[PDB]
Amino acid sequence: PSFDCGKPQVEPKKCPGVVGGCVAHPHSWPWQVSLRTRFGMHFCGGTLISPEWVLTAAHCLEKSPRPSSYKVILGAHQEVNLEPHVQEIEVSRLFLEPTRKDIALLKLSSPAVITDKVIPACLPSPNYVVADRTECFITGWGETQGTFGAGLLKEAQLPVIENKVCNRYEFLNGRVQSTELCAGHLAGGTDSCQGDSGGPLVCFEKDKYILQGVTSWGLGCARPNKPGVYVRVSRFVTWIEGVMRNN
Amino acid sequence: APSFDCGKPQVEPKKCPGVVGGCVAHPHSWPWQVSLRTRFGMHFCGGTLISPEWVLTAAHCLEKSPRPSSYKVILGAHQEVNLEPHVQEIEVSRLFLEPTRKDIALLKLSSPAVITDKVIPACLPSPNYVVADRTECFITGWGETQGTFGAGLLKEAQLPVIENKVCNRYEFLNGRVQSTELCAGHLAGGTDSCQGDSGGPLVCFEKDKYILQGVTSWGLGCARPNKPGVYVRVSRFVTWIEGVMRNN
Amino acid sequence: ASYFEPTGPYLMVNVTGVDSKGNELLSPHYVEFPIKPGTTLTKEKIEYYVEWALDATAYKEFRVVELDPSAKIEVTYYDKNKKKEETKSFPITEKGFVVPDLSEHIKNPGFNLITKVVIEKK
Numbered sequence: 001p002s003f004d005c006g007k008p009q010v011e012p013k014k015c016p017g018v019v020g021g022c023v024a025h026p027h028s029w030p031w032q033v034s035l036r037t038r039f040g041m042h043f044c045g046g047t048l049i050s051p052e053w054v055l056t057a058a059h060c061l062e063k064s065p066r067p068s069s070y071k072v073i074l075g076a077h078q079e080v081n082l083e084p085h086v087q088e089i090e091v092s093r094l095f096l097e098p099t100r101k102d103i104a105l106l107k108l109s110s111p112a113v114i115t116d117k118v119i120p121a122c123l124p125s126p127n128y129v130v131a132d133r134t135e136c137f138i139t140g141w142g143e144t145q146g147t148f149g150a151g152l153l154k155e156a157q158l159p160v161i162e163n164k165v166c167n168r169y170e171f172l173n174g175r176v177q178s179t180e181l182c183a184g185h186l187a188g189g190t191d192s193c194q195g196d197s198g199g200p201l202v203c204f205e206k207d208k209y210i211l212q213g214v215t216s217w218g219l220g221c222a223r224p225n226k227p228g229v230y231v232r233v234s235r236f237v238t239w240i241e242g243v244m245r246n247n
Numbered sequence: 248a249p250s251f252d253c254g255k256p257q258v259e260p261k262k263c264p265g266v267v268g269g270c271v272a273h274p275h276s277w278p279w280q281v282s283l284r285t286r287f288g289m290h291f292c293g294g295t296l297i298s299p300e301w302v303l304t305a306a307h308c309l310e311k312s313p314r315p316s317s318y319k320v321i322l323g324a325h326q327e328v329n330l331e332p333h334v335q336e337i338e339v340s341r342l343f344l345e346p347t348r349k350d351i352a353l354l355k356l357s358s359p360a361v362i363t364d365k366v367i368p369a370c371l372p373s374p375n376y377v378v379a380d381r382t383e384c385f386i387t388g389w390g391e392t393q394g395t396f397g398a399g400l401l402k403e404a405q406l407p408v409i410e411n412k413v414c415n416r417y418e419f420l421n422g423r424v425q426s427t428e429l430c431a432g433h434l435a436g437g438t439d440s441c442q443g444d445s446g447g448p449l450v451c452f453e454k455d456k457y458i459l460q461g462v463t464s465w466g467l468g469c470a471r472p473n474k475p476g477v478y479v480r481v482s483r484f485v486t487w488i489e490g491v492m493r494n495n
Numbered sequence: 496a497s498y499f500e501p502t503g504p505y506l507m508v509n510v511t512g513v514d515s516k517g518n519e520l521l522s523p524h525y526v527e528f529p530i531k532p533g534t535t536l537t538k539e540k541i542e543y544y545v546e547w548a549l550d551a552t553a554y555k556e557f558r559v560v561e562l563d564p565s566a567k568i569e570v571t572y573y574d575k576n577k578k579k580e581e582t583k584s585f586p587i588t589e590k591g592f593v594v595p596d597l598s599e600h601i602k603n604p605g606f607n608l609i610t611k612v613v614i615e616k617k
């Protein structure tokens with residue numbers, strides 16, 4: 001027999017309390033992808049759901065509709081000058097969420113070779129709503145404000161804040177739709193930021209990590225009372241499945 | 248803002264870290280954004296509505312014809328090609344180049360533009376005002392993409408002001424950045440607005456409104472590494488500008 | 496700490512443009528519009544603002560049919576006097592309502608509008 005998905009091949013780091021947080025164990029987060037334009041820099045992240053399919057954030061695909069102008073980097077830790085076994089597949093087709101939500105699917109013009117450095121992430125059960133203060137991990141090569149790590153794959157363990165709370169006047173003041181979740185320390189300091197978009201918000205559930213979010217937006221980075229907003233993948237697991245089965 | 252002041256958009260600007268290499272703006276969040284058009288032909292240069300009858304631009308945008316009634320400004324636009332209803336297209340009466348020129352000239356609108364929530368002038372800075380290091384500025388303009396592309400829709404691009412001391416620091420530009428020039432962007436790039444956006448505004452936010460701190464004239468590449476863009480420092484010519492309008 | 500928000504009072508339009516049978520058609524990212532304290536906000540102006548926002552996400556496509564009976568145009572702030580939090584709330588109507596002051600308590604209160612609106616698409 002056999003099995004994978006959500007079970008990384010390296011015990012992930014650990015730093016309680018991307019701007020802030022800490023650099024990750026090289027290869028502890030195998031599903032992380034890095035959107036990079038042809039002969040162009042890394043600008044967003046993504047996460048591998050299938051060897052062929054990558055889940056990202058529709059606004060990263062704002063520039064070109066041409067699949068051809070997008071490239072995917074799988075199995076890395078370094079943003080600049082990756083290891084020799086890092087895979088770099090090219091995009092076949094762009095599938096943005098039809099109603100304009102900030103989520104989309106990238107079909108790889110060639111499937112990603114699964115290795116102990118490349119493993120998909122497990123998808124959530126449809127419509128499941130991540131608890132209130134559940135601690136999840138956000139990862140990616142996004143910017144920061146002159147902090148601890150950088151050209152490396154940083155990570156962060158943030159507590160989920162429920163729409164109920166994050167839509168309060170001090171926080172996001174009702175800008176959070178039911179289709180998005182919040183995660184962060186009201187104190188700020190640690191958070192995702194530009195360049196992380198599309199990346200995963202994985203929440204550990206028993207044995208594997210479940211992809212519970214797609215980095216999408218936020219009012220600044222790591223500013224207090226301003227958590228980060230993520231698309232709730234449980235509200236799109238059926239649609240995602242539809243695109244994959246019929247394409 | 249009350250009625251229609253200046254530097255005060257009537258829709259909140261969609262900010263974006265990041266014209267090329269910047270997100271498409273929310274319709275009419277940059278009311279001062281103008282589009283210069285040839286008599287028959289379309290776009291080629293952008294501009295800033297400095298007052299109801301005055302527009303500031305890049306002088307090299309006027310290479311094609313010295314005559315003032317050769318250009319037409321378009322105000323209240325988002326679509327560069329097709330063009331919607333209320334989108335005032337004023338004809339230009341006179342053209343005033345700036346002496347001791349860097350690249351700026353004043354276009355005088357034969358008819359004062361109709362100030363509405365989609366068309367409003369920009370605020371000028373105070374004389375020799377020096378826009379601080381790290382200040383978040385905004386590059387806005389339709390100009391280019393995959394050549395002519397640009398969604399046809401007005402795009403922006405958020406860029407922080409560098410600092411003429413550091414900008415000139417050998418490893419990128421050598422005192423080629425003068426005191427009458429503004430240096431903004433970054434040393435990594437991937438969002439510097441280039442070409443067809445010439446003359447467009449570089450409005451930096453301050454307290455509650457937007458100020459015309461620079462004019463898109465050049466950069467030296469097209470969004471990239473150690474090469475921050477170089478816009479003409481508008482606070483230097485705020486006097487001249489001011490004195491053109493009071494008389495001309 | 497300068498990753499900005501509206502400096503003065505603002506209306507914030509976060510509406511899911513669906514069809515009539517409820518089916519979603521457009522989910523335009525919220526957009527905030529500066530409104531002055533003292534002006535009047537009629538059913539008409541709200542719609543000028545719901546459109547203004549649908550276009551910001553799906554430009555010139557779609558048009559509004561029926562906003563939705565639920566006048567979800569409420570504002571919340573902290574009352575330093577009651578020593579509690581107040582949540583005002585207004586109705587979307589032809590007669591409108593005058594935009595309250597609230598500076599007394601809040602520098603930039605957000606008059607949120609969060610409803611599903613029936614759009615048809617041009």
Ligand SMILES: *C[C@@](*)(O)[C@H](CCCNC(N)=[NH2+])NC(=O)CNC(=O)[C@@H](N)CCC(=O)O
Pocket residue numbers: 043044057059060191192193194195196197198215216217218219220221222227228229261262263264524
């Ligand atoms: C596109 C993606 O790279 C970034 C990620 C920033 C994450 N933010 C926080 N606080 N963790 N996403 C964006 O830049 C999207 N835009 C914004 O977050 C805001 N600048 C604008 C909000 C909007 O209109 O969507």
